[PDB]
Amino acid sequence: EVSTLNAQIPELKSDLEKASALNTKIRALQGSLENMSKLLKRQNDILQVVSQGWKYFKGNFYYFSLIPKTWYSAEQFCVSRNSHLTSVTSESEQEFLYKTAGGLIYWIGLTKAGMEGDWSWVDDTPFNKVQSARFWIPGEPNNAGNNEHCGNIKAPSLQAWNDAPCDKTFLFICKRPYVP
Amino acid sequence: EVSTLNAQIPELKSDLEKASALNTKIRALQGSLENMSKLLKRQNDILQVVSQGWKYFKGNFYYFSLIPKTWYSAEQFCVSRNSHLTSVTSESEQEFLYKTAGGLIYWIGLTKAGMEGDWSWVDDTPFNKVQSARFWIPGEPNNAGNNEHCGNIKAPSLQAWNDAPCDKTFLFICKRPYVP
Amino acid sequence: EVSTLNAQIPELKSDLEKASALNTKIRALQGSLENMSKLLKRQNDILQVVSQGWKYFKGNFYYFSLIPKTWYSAEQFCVSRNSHLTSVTSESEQEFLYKTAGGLIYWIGLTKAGMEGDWSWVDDTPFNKVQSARFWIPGEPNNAGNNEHCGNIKAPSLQAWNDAPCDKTFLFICKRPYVP
Amino acid sequence: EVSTLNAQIPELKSDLEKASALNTKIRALQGSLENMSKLLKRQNDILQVVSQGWKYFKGNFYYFSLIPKTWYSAEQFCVSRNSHLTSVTSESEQEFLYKTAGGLIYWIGLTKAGMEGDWSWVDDTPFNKVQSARFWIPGEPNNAGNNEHCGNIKAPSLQAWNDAPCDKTFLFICKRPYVP
Amino acid sequence: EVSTLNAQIPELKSDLEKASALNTKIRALQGSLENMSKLLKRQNDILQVVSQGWKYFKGNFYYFSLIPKTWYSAEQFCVSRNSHLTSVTSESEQEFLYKTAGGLIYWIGLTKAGMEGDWSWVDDTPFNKVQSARFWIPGEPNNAGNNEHCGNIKAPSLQAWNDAPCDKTFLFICKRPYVP
Amino acid sequence: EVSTLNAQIPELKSDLEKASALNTKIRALQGSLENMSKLLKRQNDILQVVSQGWKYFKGNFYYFSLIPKTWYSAEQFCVSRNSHLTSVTSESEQEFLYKTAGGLIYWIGLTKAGMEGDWSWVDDTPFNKVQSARFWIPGEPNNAGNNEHCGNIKAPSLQAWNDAPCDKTFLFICKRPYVP
């Protein structure tokens, strides 16, 4: 009866760490498969809008228009595309916008509003004077002829924003935030 | 010997139920892994065609041409691209076509046939008059000048189809179904 | 005690074989999950460049320019985009280039060097005379006016290369290899 | 009869020439007398308002208030005195205003208005950016707290204008043009 | 002798007409110069008192004190300045007084006398109840505490007179008539 | 010929007599008009300085400060106004100063100089101690605390001068002579 005990008790160990290891593997595998499922569904959601002629950058779909429209008409078209004239909130966003622009001028959300005519984004994004000055073309805004109250990206460089009358047609970047 | 049995028999229940759980987890993890492998290979199949200047929608690849050509010349080019002039079979197809068109005009598979000029699709897609009724521009088809026997999408709206002579150049949407 | 042995020894076979099966599962699953993780990260690396207006083919990103520039100006722009004028090294590359070109003309890395004007690639790619002859338009190179010392793809066919002076403006295909 | 002729003809010369001199005297003395008449009327008109505690400068009466009022209330009091918060249209105007101020702060016609919040004069005097540039205290306007939309003379120097909220009580310079 | 007579008679007539006209000039010019000399003398008389910090109105000199005094002390100071506390005999005088006051309160010649306490002027000016009725502040005189027996100009309006005990200090308007 | 002579002789006599009278009146009128023109020029010169809040007395312009300053700071301000701290050269000037002061305190040009500290005027006016003694407040100068080396006018009387330390802030009378 000694040999059977010296066989059973190590069986007790072996199956206890066996069950413990199986539990650890099941929990870790469940977590990892849930994470990869989220990753794949997010990627699939990414793919479709980009496949329909839209660009993507930092959680925003940007449609670089094939047809030119005026600042407010461009905003209307972007709204019809459930979007707005692109509002730049960072260095990287401006960089991507003027790089994908390929040298083309795109109306953006910049417009003079308020009692002081301060600049603002059409999509109600806050206008950071300090940050915006770095994105503005040198000498701009100058309000040439006192009629330059809308902004557009012209230069393929960080300082791409020029002020100009809202009334004239341009290509435009329709911006709508990514949502899962 | 009683303690040995009271140790052996619960070991029987434990290892039996745990091997059953092993069977369950093996089968579930397997089915999920071939499922995700199929999803991965399908998305890989999807991505390359889009990466080469093509658009995709509901299992069909649509090329919105950068060069305008006539109706039958566009059909020839699409055939050379293993495709055809896009035939519209659903609300979603027409919507996607005119939205990705971005206001541009694209030849489609609409063409008259026979002595009475019944409309039909070039890619042998059946043409349902009642179903295709609301896809036509109002007043169209009118066969203006009695020479309007091919269809093209102009308006960024559901009523975008217009009949017009087949002999003039326009942009075109080459359509070939996605095949894995 | 005989029944105890006849019950516990098969427990030995069962637990050893199931531990071996668990080992097989762990190793195979670990290898497969590492492989699919690598595939996922490579796919993520691929997708963003194409999502920003670029094309992709066999580990090389090709930007088909929206703005035309001369041979050396196009090379400068491509370098600014961390790339070069595309050098064609295979049948597949030439085919993809003239197919995604959509009938458009693009400057490539072809250039003459030295007093004898031996042809070569700008990106230091070796120039295969035998292979390149199959890619050159018939009658080309001809050095029309003794001034045609660069190369561009015009025809949507295998024999797409025509020689031309380096100083004339054309669209261009910026080429940079895919790096993980 | 010779002597009477030689006496009477020079009588003709003398009385004719002195009648001419009489005409010259009449015209000159007249012109001078009504000229000094208008001058005397103008000085009598000038003296009366000055005698009533008002100051005078280049055809404008400026009442340097003995009681402080807010910008809008100061304008109300000035209007009640058939005047307005003083505008500044010249170097001499600003100089006289801050010199007669004697170091005291006086509300002036400066106020932000219009879609761009541009500065303007309460008395409807046109406001020139370039002209009024040097009349502002250095660093002003700064719109401290984004609430400084009226102007007052503080410094006993050319750069006397500081922007401030219109709601603060200050001495004020009532301005009304001299009218004959 | 005929010609000399036909020259002499017009000589006499012209000499007589010229002499009469010169008499007209002499008399008219003498009268005008004497009148303007008197006016200039009066202007010189007027200007000197005003130049010494005094105000002037319709033949009276009014000193608006910079230091407050009690009613009787103010009267003593005015007497020392060869004047008296100002008495108001017309609407224009009251208007000038309160307008030059600029909202400030000034002791005036109002004082009660006799066992019934009838009001009167300190400078022996007759007191018109009917006229003074419209110069008192509405509700005044009320003789608050039965101790209000002196008058001061308070309001920036015609009804500026307020009654108060004579023992408190106010600014004061010393009044002395203009005499050539 | 008798009658014509008895008419000619009175003609000559009257013409000569009234010609002499015209000469006399011309000279007298010219002198009077030149004198009154000079007087009017002087009056126009006088009026402007007084019109800007300044006082005048016997060829000197005195500014009674609305803001107080220390003795040396008052002198600096007076110099900046092209003037100096007022010096007294006559009894009438002292009378005018303390009467226009209206009981207020004003710094004057009295200051000690040299190792014996003899008194003198800041504007280099000679010190008439014989006349100055009649203008000092009784008991003054006393040099209280051996630190009283400047002069101030406080008392509304001829004896208005008091010695006092130069470092404290009083009102001041800026004095500058009238020059045509």
Author numbering:
A (entry chain E), B (entry chain F), C (entry chain D), D (entry chain A), E (entry chain B), F (entry chain C): 146 to 325
Provide the authors' original text about this structure:
Upon contact with Langerhans cells, pathogens are captured by the C-type lectin langerin and internalized into a structurally unique vesicle known as a Birbeck granule. Langerin is a type II transmembrane protein that is composed of a cytoplasmic tail, coiled-coil neck region, and carbohydrate recognition domain (CRD). Through the coiled-coil neck region, langerin forms a trimer, which is functionally important for oligosaccharide binding. The calcium-dependent carbohydrate-binding capacity of langerin CRD is essential for the formation of Birbeck granules because the removal of calcium ions causes them to unzip and disintegrate.
To purify these Birbeck granules, we expressed SNAP-tagged human langerin in 293T cells, biotinylated the tag by incubation with benzylguanine-biotin, and immunoprecipitated the Birbeck granules using streptavidin agarose. We conducted cryo-electron tomography of the isolated Birbeck granules and reconstructed the repeating units by averaging the subtomograms. The resolution was improved to 6.4 Å, which clearly visualized the alpha helices and enabled us to generate a model based on the previously reported crystal structure of the langerin trimer. We then performed a two-body refinement to visualize the spatial relationship between the two opposing langerin trimers. The interaction between the two CRDs appears to be maintained by docking the loops of two langerin molecules into each other’s lateral cleft, which constitutes the secondary carbohydrate-binding site. The interaction between the two CRDs is flexible because the first eigenvector of the multi-body analysis represents an approximately 30° tilting motion with the loop as the fulcrum. The docked loop 258–263 may provide additional interactions with the hydroxyl group of mannose via Glu261 and Asp263, thus increasing the affinity of the secondary binding site when two langerin trimers form a complex. To investigate the importance of loop 258–263 in the biogenesis of Birbeck granules, we mutated three residues in the loop: Met260Ala, Glu261Arg, and Asp263Lys, and generated three mutated langerin constructs, each carrying one (MRGD), two (MRGK), or three mutations (ARGK). In contrast, the internalization of the pseudovirus was significantly inhibited by the ARGK mutation. These results suggest that disruption of Birbeck granule formation by the mutation of loop 258–263 inhibited the internalization of HIV pseudovirus.
